[model samples]
Target: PKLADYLKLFRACKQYWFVFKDTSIAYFKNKELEQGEPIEKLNLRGCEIVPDVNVSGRKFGIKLLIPVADGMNEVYLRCDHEDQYARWMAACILASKGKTMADSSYQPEVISILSFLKMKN
Candidate 1:
């Protein structure tokens, strides 16, 4: 459920105003209420996250490039600070790579230890 929680935090960040669900990203016209249909829905498959500067010629912002009918369509997402950028970048890359907390193999060592302790108790 950590991935779901991260998605909630991402929505709250209000930087890019995107909704993450079902391994897809959707844009909201009104971020505060998330009203109306999404402007676009992009699947995680075949998506790449890269620095916007490489594509937009800008020093700031991150770009989500997804394959389209003609070629690739780029979506630029901005963050308030470097830390936020790093967090968002990691989330996007993980999502694109099909990483999710729901996987049994994704559990951390600490979690296993805690589970063992609970069983012993």
Candidate 2:
């Protein structure tokens, strides 16, 4: 009943079809085929930022420590497009602070992460 129970030993990475909806993050697929199933779903009611590795400066990775029953899902999100990455990360920080995602907030929130993630880790 633990998500990260064996993640350390069975280290494998995959970029699944992802989505962020209603404070929930879901990844579909794996252990099946056709009409993939959404097996990995996480609640982000009170998401906390952990850290992640990013040798590439032009990258996006943030760990989520959700405020659930000991839910420490080490999800280091990465994106191929900065537009998408910044948009969501900015949205995520808002989500972390128990705030709803706003439309006119990306003015500098997108670039704000640059200073924070400047030259990434």
Candidate 3:
């Protein structure tokens, strides 16, 4: 799914190509990676993935609060469909918690919570 990414508050959100690989999300201005370098990259560690609104209100948008050198950068990622939202939400949540890059890292605690999150009904 194409992602509409909000990089800054003073400017309009830009629609760019976002790919989640390892523990980072790289957004590119150009559709093809070979065409140009990535404009921005986001790390999932200790990042907050907040839904666009509260639980009471629903939408296919999520706000990511990532801490930087000075303060925190509030980034908004939006999709057009539910599955797109679910898959990314799950992947980002897991990646942010180090489950993806931590195969040799976390023991059963992460695995236990992983099962609880995606597998539990």
Candidate 4:
């Protein structure tokens, strides 16, 4: 599959980061494995990101709720700030809808709103 976009985000497990893309999420066990193949790959289709407000007890912390065949899997993530969180949430939502940033219509509205807010302020 064509990888439309990529973001390196920190994962709670293994104290390592993972690569989140429009189509899938991949985690490598080690640097060598990262260069060769991902130890785990998760499809973004039909996945959901339910925010867990109480996990990290930090304002920027969020836990993504992903549904699996057996049950739901939770991923703990901490964004540097709310802006980063919004961007990641938007991207993930789009990915779940079978869309990518390249073909997203969501950006214009968000940009317009931000622009308006800036002008208002």
CA lDDT scores, all candidates in order: 0.53, 0.55, 0.59, 0.55
- Candidate closer to the true structure by TM-score (higher is better), 1 or 4: 4
lDDT tens digits by residue: candidate 2, 9-110: 011656555655555666654323314566667667677875343546554456676656574656666655445566566667766765545445544777
lDDT of 1 by residue, 38-60 (tens): 66677766688775432223233
Write the residue-wise lDDT of candidate 3 on 1-121 in tens digits.
Answer: 2233322221176576677667778877645562468777789777887865222233457677887999888887775544455556665676668655345543343354335334322
> Could you give the candidate ranking by lDDT, starting with the highest?
3, 2, 4, 1
Question: Which candidate tops TM-score?
Answer: 3
Candidate 3 C-alpha RMSD relative to the actual structure: 6.3
**CA lDDT, candidate 2, residue 29:** 48
Ranking by TM-score: 3, 2, 4, 1
How much is the lDDT of residue 9 in candidate 1? Answer: 21
TM-score of each: 0.56, 0.61, 0.66, 0.58
TM match of model 2 to true structure: 0.61
